[PDB]
Design a protein around this nucleic acid. Sequence first.
RNA 1: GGUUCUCCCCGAAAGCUAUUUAGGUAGCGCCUCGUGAAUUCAUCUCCGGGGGUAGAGCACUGUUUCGGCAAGGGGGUCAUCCCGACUUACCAACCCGAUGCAAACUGCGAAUACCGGAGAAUGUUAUCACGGGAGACACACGGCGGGUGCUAACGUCCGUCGUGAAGAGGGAAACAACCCAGACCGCCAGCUAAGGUCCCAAAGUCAUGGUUAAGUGGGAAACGAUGUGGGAAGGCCCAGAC
RNA 2: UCCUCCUAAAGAGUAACGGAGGAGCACGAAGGUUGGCUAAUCCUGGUCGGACAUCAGGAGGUUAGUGCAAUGGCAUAAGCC
RNA 3: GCUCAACGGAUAAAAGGUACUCCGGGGAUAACAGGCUGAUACCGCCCAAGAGUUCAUAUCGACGGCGGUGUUUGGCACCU
RNA 4: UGCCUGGCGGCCGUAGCGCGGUGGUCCCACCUGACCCCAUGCCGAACUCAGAAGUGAAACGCCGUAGCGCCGAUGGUAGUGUGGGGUCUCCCCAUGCGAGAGUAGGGAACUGCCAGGCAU
Lengths: 69, 136, 94, 58, 116, 75
Amino acid sequence: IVISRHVAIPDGELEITAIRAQGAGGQHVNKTSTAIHLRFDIRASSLPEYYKERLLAASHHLISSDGVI
Amino acid sequence: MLQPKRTKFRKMHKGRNRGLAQGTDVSFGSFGLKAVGRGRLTARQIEAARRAMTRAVKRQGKIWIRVFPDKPITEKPLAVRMGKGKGNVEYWVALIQPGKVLYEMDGVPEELAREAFKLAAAKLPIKTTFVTKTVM
Amino acid sequence: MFTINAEVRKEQGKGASRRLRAANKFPAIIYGGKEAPLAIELDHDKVMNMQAKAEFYSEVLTIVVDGKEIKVKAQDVQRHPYKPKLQHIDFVRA
Amino acid sequence: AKTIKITQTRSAIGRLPKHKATLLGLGLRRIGHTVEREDTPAIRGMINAVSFMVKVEE
Amino acid sequence: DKKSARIRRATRARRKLQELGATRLVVHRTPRHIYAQVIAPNGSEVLVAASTVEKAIAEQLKYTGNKDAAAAVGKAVAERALEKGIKDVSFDRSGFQYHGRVQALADAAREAGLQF
Amino acid sequence: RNGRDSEAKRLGVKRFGGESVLAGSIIVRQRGTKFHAGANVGCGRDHTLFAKADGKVKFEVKGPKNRKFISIEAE
RNA sequence: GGUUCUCCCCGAAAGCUAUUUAGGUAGCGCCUCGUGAAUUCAUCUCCGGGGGUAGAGCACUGUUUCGGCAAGGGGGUCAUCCCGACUUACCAACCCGAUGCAAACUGCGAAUACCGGAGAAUGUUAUCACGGGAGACACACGGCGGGUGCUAACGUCCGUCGUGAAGAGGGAAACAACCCAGACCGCCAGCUAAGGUCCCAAAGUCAUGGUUAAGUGGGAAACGAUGUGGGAAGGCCCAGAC
RNA sequence: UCCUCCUAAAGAGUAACGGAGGAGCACGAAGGUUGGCUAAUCCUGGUCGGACAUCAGGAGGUUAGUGCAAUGGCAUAAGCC
RNA sequence: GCUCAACGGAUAAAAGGUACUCCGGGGAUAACAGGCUGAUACCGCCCAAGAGUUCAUAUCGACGGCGGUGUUUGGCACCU
RNA sequence: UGCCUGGCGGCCGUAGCGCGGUGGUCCCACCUGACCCCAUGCCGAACUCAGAAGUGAAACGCCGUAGCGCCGAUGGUAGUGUGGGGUCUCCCCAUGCGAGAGUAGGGAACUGCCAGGCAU
Ligand SMILES: [Mg+2]
Ligand SMILES: [Mg+2]
Ligand SMILES: [Mg+2]
Ligand SMILES: [Mg+2]
Ligand SMILES: [Mg+2]
Ligand SMILES: [Mg+2]
Ligand SMILES: [Mg+2]
Ligand SMILES: [Mg+2]
Ligand SMILES: [Mg+2]
Ligand SMILES: [Mg+2]
Ligand SMILES: [Mg+2]
Ligand SMILES: [Mg+2]
Ligand SMILES: [Mg+2]
Ligand SMILES: [Mg+2]
Ligand SMILES: [Mg+2]
Ligand SMILES: [Mg+2]
Ligand SMILES: [Mg+2]
Ligand SMILES: [Mg+2]
Ligand SMILES: [Mg+2]
Ligand SMILES: [Mg+2]
Ligand SMILES: [Mg+2]
Ligand SMILES: [Mg+2]
Ligand SMILES: [Mg+2]
Ligand SMILES: [Mg+2]
Ligand SMILES: [Mg+2]
Ligand SMILES: [Mg+2]
Ligand SMILES: [Mg+2]
Ligand SMILES: [Mg+2]
Ligand SMILES: [Mg+2]
Ligand SMILES: [Mg+2]
Ligand SMILES: [Mg+2]
Ligand SMILES: [Mg+2]
Ligand SMILES: [Mg+2]
Ligand SMILES: [Mg+2]
Ligand SMILES: [Mg+2]
Ligand code: NA
């Protein structure tokens, strides 16, 4: 929701879905959607430049090649 | 954010909200916003109403908040079982009975009075009206 | 000098007074002095109009009961909590 | 002296134990059952206690 | 002060006597003219009160307000009590320390019939 | 934390006014001298008021402090 | 898990306390059988009782707003040296006035309930004691007072009442616990309760006034609107208004 | 396990993995009894000495204390000698 | 003479694993699913500070509020 | 019989506090003195003793005084038992009980026994 003392996330630019986890767990991890899958567009979010720019000028495994985290 | 500076106990019972109200007649200002309904006013609500009210008028006028939350309402964290003790204080509310004058105001023409009080009552979960100070 | 008609409260108490206030009247009590205070029922719309004037309480009033006329000053009034209504008034004789 | 005739008009089923005992202290057993009792203040109070399920013809 | 201090000193034993229900003999010393009384358990009426302030005991003494005058008063209340049939009483210091004039009165009355 | 308590003591007024008693029969159990020892009524170390004569209880407001006393009238 | 012929009579509990105890058991509470005994018991009225709950209040414990106030504080008028004057442009204790709030606040304080006494009526002794026999200690919903929970739950845990359990019949379409109501048996007899009366489907297309235009009736909030019925006043206006 | 308040619905009782605290002792004087005494705070003075010791007066009126928690008491003091 | 304190104390004296497992029971009680609820989730609406060159309502909407759905994770443990 | 005073009470603020006034024949109080009876955790302050020289100044009693304190109606409201109903975490209706606060006002205590002084 917040990063620095100045920039923050209004949650109106951050969609989350509840999907299933992996690995062990029994008949629970099968049905129950307990893992979180978070998507966050940067190109079209209320973030400053030098944040949008600095993300899109990076190579992190969380950042998709389409400017979405 | 109104709050009891150094209360006595942290958590208190839910209780009830039966009866009519006591802060009923306009005491301080020329006019006021009586509560026709019944319920609770979170500190966030009182703050938003006071801001929506003190901005509709400029720094002109004077406003009295005849309500103060002084009741800690607790909620359990998300995804917990029942039991294991009472929750944790998360906000403070003032129980409002029909008749409690929530905001008094003076120093502005009744035009600004009614307008600001409508702008404020838009931010409250409880029916309100507009009352004038009465005599005898 | 506001003239106010009236009637003696036939039966008194909470239930009767609530029936009264539902009948578009309301009670009031004239006391002050040595005579027994007079329990009065009296119309609501007239009186709620009268009290709207800033003179209703500063001046004197002529309560009419069985032809009798009483000069009184409204000492104390029980208003409704949130409705523009009156529940009761203390009319002090003289 | 003067007696008074009392009937039952409602069921004593969903009634409080005080009212069960009061109907017993009147002598009423059924709905429509009628009895005759001395008209004493104790009896008149015993009636206005269950005034909702007893009909009186003084 | 002085008066209420002594009175609260007395209140304890006064109330204890009022509890025990005894016909209590009371003493009120005073820089002059020591007084004495005898009051029934209900405490609203006395039976014997022989104090120096009576002119029968006035002249017969040098100074009302010495242990000797107190002894005369004690003998006087004792005689009047044995006249009133009161054999025994319970002494009341009334806050006064049972040392000087009050002790003189008490010893006198004790030797003069009253079984307190 | 919380969760503790103590078994209730069963204090109170075991005998009320106008209530015949025997000698020594307890009348009031209490902590303080909320009710004070009147005539024919004792006061145990528990501040328990008990009877000192077979009579009838009586509550009064004797005294300048209005403290309530409990007498027993052998009626 | 199962436990086998019949009728009649009474008929519970799912609570407390303790338990390597929690789904078992033991005493007691509740049922039954026998005996004994007292207005012994209940209800109503009166009389004597103690409370500190609801409500209220803010003297107390805190808490809260506004204002007046001001010891002090801290600046300069100060060097106007033992000492105090002013001001503070300001900072404010205490106190006062006006406004609320409290399960763990109370100088106030019910209704009820409970205890005790007396008085009649009624109750198949309705009561207590002992003895034979138990069962039961998994309770549920509804109302009322609550904690907890989210002033969520057919949630949970308490107090109290009712019901189901262990009670059928009528109503709520259907619907253990809601409303009416307690089934000994038979009747092709009647009056009623809740609930109903156009047809399914027994009973009013009932009578008098009203309202609703929505199929509202026959799901729902903030809020919004010349919807329409009413009431009370007003403003301007035949010195002719809108 | 025991104690105190509240929940607990003005008799008793009353549950929660409900809300707030405590104890597993101390004392031959901290008990008995007799006698005596009366607090906290603030103000004004007054050697350091200050906001705050001690001294005095005043206001106050028990807002102190109660060997240790809370409640209930406690001026006849249960408080201090 | 016992922190027999698990404090009505079962012995003077006793810790674990089991996915190699077994038996007796339970939906009295969990995992899945259905259920009641709707915190959470999602969706809509009210207010309008502001942003929108000026202009709140093209578009967006602070501080706050009112609901709907029953897609999530929960809650309860009602069915198995 | 009237007043004043002292003791012991009933009663516990309609009785207390304040403000103004007044009292010394008796009483009471202050007071004088203290080797002593006794006394201080130092002090004849207090307690105690031996007396009254002096004063009602303080104290206390009494009178007036509402400035508080206190008491306190009548109605109305709140709450509530029982029955019923709703638009139901809140109410309404029929009935019974009915406050609290506040208001009008009241309010400068009343009183028994004994003893003394004075009037008589
Ligand atoms: Mg009513
Ligand atoms: Mg129980
Ligand atoms: Mg309350
Ligand atoms: Mg069991
Ligand atoms: Mg059980
Ligand atoms: Mg409930
Ligand atoms: Mg069963
Ligand atoms: Mg049935
Ligand atoms: Mg049926
Ligand atoms: Mg059916
Ligand atoms: Mg249905
Ligand atoms: Mg029924
Ligand atoms: Mg039959
Ligand atoms: Mg018929
Ligand atoms: Mg038909
Ligand atoms: Mg429809
Ligand atoms: Mg209780
Ligand atoms: Mg109770
Ligand atoms: Mg001690
Ligand atoms: Mg002593
Ligand atoms: Mg001691
Ligand atoms: Mg145990
Ligand atoms: Mg064991
Ligand atoms: Mg292997
Ligand atoms: Mg198996
Ligand atoms: Mg099975
Ligand atoms: Mg499930
Ligand atoms: Mg289940
Ligand atoms: Mg369950
Ligand atoms: Mg299923
Ligand atoms: Mg003189
Ligand atoms: Mg002297
Ligand atoms: Mg003088
Ligand atoms: Mg009152
Ligand atoms: Mg006489
Ligand atoms: Na007014």
